[PDB]
Amino acid sequence: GSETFQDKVNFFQRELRQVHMKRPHSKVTLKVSRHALLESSLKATRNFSISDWSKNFEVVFQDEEGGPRREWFELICKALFDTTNQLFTRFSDNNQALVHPNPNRPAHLRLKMYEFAGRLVGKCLYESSLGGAYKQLVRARFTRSFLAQIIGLRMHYKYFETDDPEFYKSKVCFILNNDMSEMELVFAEEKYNKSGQLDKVVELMTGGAQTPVTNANKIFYLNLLAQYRLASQVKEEVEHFLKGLNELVPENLLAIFDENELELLMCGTGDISVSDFKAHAVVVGGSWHFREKVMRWFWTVVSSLTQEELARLLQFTTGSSQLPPGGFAALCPSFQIIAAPTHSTLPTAHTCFNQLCLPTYDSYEEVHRMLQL
Amino acid sequence: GSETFQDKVNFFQRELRQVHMKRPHSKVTLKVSRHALLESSLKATRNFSISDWSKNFEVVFQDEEGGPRREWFELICKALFDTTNQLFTRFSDNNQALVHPNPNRPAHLRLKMYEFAGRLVGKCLYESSLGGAYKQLVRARFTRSFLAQIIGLRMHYKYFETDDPEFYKSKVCFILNNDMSEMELVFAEEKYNKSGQLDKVVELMTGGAQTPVTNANKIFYLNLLAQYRLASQVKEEVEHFLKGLNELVPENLLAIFDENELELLMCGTGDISVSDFKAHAVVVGGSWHFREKVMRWFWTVVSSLTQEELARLLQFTTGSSQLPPGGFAALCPSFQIIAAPTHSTLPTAHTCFNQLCLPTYDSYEEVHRMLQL
Incomplete structure (x- = not known):
């Protein structure tokens, strides 16, 4: 007596078509450069409206004239989410780990790029909703914490297991698996500089430094820590990401999903052998x-x-x-x-x-x- | 206000020399065959007394006539403990795991071989005790459960961590790390045949099948299980192993050691780079x-x-x-x-x-x- 994944997808895709019934089934052109794809893709669409983002994309590259549409979506997704440009980034230096908006971004990546990311993820969901002809899956392996921020959920320490293994294995597990009554930890985090000197301690709440981690508030600690590491350091980047997302996809629609379903809705059931x-x-x-x-x-x-x-x-x-x-x-x-x-x-x-x-x-x-x- | 490892070694080596003051500082010959080293080493010493095992070994191989003494000790240790002949064996099929007397030995390995093992481990400890000239370290990586049986200790589930990783990782950890109040496990173990059919259930105590694993008796379970898997299935092999050991080294002497010290006393501090x-x-x-x-x-x-x-x-x-x-x-x-x-x-x-x-x-x-x- 509840709802299967497939039911949610059909409801979501139907609700989404109806949101754009009044948006037009006509053409709009992009001209992009493989050399600098993100930068040229931004400029290609700089003049566009929300209405324009609903129209079918006719993509032309320089140096070769549906075949390029798929190619553009494939490459734009990599350009954003593949982390080469450090627009998105992983916490673990493993090249299989999941990706997250950059906590400390190079200045040379403006916030407009996150908005564009959101418009692009929006467009994939939207075209995906029209039929098998138009389907575009998002080619990205997002952190659960990021998918959860999209939906609008509170951060929970469970998200560390998937998003920062090193940190789960090392610190979170330790705290969950030990007596805090003989450790003298507190509700602060100590930040150190490049070199390794204590530049500043950061209380997770007022008097956090004064508050010791007991076995009774162990979990409140871990999730206050989840908020800090996974969400607090990226408020701005996510706010802009979903300014873009919410232009094509109203946020209330995505509420019916949890993080793992939202991954399946965005990126498909893939092909697993x-x-x-x-x-x-x-x-x-x-x-x-x-x-x-x-x-x-x-x-x-x-x-x-x-x-x-x-x-x-x-x-x-x-x-x-x-x-x-x-x-x-x-x-x-x-x-x-x-x-x-x-x-x-x-x-x-x-x-x-x-x-x-x-x-x-x-x-x-x-x-x-x-x-x- | 207690005793360092080195102190124990000096006490043990001194006490051991005094046990053999009346045993002779003279020569005895072995003739062995590299082809079949264990079998020829048994027959070489079949006629010997306890007194003879105290005397310095003059070893001669067939096909080349101190240099062979070291070589014999090196090879005899491998022959016994290297697990090729499945006299000793590992629980994990990893070729780095520690070794244990064979629970289910090929019939073609008699119990005399375990006694010989004990005499050999005895002799290494004894020669090691006379000085740098005579020193022979045991070349073997024993299970902690086995070292503990030598000393005369009760089995504890901690020993699984070192002796049967697969089993710690899979079952022991599960039990230690879960609520037993929604599992319906009991104080029995189910044995299955080669193929995979339940031939017999074995109660770890009377009515074990009738007794459910609670969270309160979880540990009593795990150690009753440690007794069963690590010790119960090898009583005979260990009894003979230390019949041999106790001929040169009285058991009460080894009491002053725990399992990890006994490893250091038997096998040395090695050379770690x-x-x-x-x-x-x-x-x-x-x-x-x-x-x-x-x-x-x-x-x-x-x-x-x-x-x-x-x-x-x-x-x-x-x-x-x-x-x-x-x-x-x-x-x-x-x-x-x-x-x-x-x-x-x-x-x-x-x-x-x-x-x-x-x-x-x-x-x-x-x-x-x-x-x-």
Whole structure:
């Protein structure tokens, strides 16, 4: 007695067409330069209205005259979100980590660029809504904290698991997994300069320095910390990003989504290859019953899953519905299935380690029901 | 106001010489065959007495006639403990894991071989005790559970972290880290055949099947499980191993040691190469203060440590005082230093992941005091 992902998408796409019923089904031209794509794409659209952003894009590059439309969307997305230009950025220096608006941006990237990003993400959602002909998926692996800011949610420390592994593994886990009664931590963060000298302490709330982290307020600490690191340092960039987004897509429409659904709505169910999965996956622990009966039920159920559920699975265990550049062999920590000692419990995960905690199930049909996350 | 490792060693070596004052400082010959070293080494010594095991070994191989004594000790240790002959064995199919008497031995390995193992480990300890001239270190990476059985200690689930990672990671961690109030586990273990059919359930105590794992008896479960997996299945092999050990080394002498000290007494402080350490070590998380000031204090303190403390460190973070075959580049998970958010707390570790949890220290001298485990 509630709503499936597909239902939300149809409602969202319908509501969105109706928002633009009065916007025109006609043509508008862009001329862009592969050399400097972002800069030329901004200038191409500098004179456009909201109405113009609704019209079908006729893209022409210099040095070759639908084929270029797809090519433009592909490249513009990379240009913005691929982090080369450090407009977006990752917290972990791993080149498979998810991306986030730059907390401390080079001055040479104005806030107009974030607004443009939002218009572009807006346009992909909008064209995606008109039919299979016009579909444009966003080619980007966003942080959950960023997707959540788009929707309008409070930050929670769970977001660190996906957005700053180093930081979850190192500090958050420590705090969650230790007695705070013999540590003397507080509700401040100490910032240090390039070199490593304490330039300033920053209270997460008034008297934060005076307030010690107990075991009772441990969680209030961690989320005050989530607010600070993931959202507080990027208010401006996100505000402009969704000024742009909200021109084509009103914010109230996106409320019906959580962060992982919004990823699936923006970037699609992708194409995930059970053959690549089987090849670079890893199994850990479990009886002969697990190693032999459960894991073959698993791979059977897997080859019997919609492109949509295969993505729901990849997202539930790794953090994103999307594989990095190098497919399953690029996953930071290899996609792994750990045996739980339970029978007939809900399967769990640890997305920091790309780990799926698969109970030792008694029937094929119980594996099938449970891999339908 | 207690006793340093070195003090224990001197007491142990002195007490041990005095046990053999009346045993003779004369010669006895062995003739062995590299082809079949264990079998020929048994037959070489089949006729010997306890008294004979005290005498200096003159070893002759077939096909070349101190140089062979060292060579024999080197090879005999490998023959027993290197697990090729599956006399000893590892739980994890990783070829860097620690070794344990075989729970389910090929019939073609009699119990006399375990007794011989004990005599050999005995002899190494004994010759080691006479001086630098006679020193023979045991070349083996034993499970902590095995070292603890030698000393005469109860099994504790902590031993799984070092002895069966797969099993700690998969089952033990799960139980320690979850609410048992919504799982319905019990004080039994289910054994399955080669194929994967439930042949028999085994209660860890009377009515174990009837007794549910609560959050209150979670630990009693885990250690009853430690007894079962690490000790219960090898009573006979260990009994014979220390029949042999106790001929040259009375058991009461070894009581003054814990498992990690007994490893250092048997196998030495080895030779561990700060240059190899620096090269294949890994750092995770921490401020610029940590990344820049603390980690250089660390590597400084490291190059200023006795061979003995360097081993105490390697043991505290990886599980053994001894590197695998391929030096630091062979460590299952790379030797890693994680930043803790604390200042001036005792450094902690996770030996399953070869992880050292190094607080963010305020002085060089605080790093020095704390790396003296």
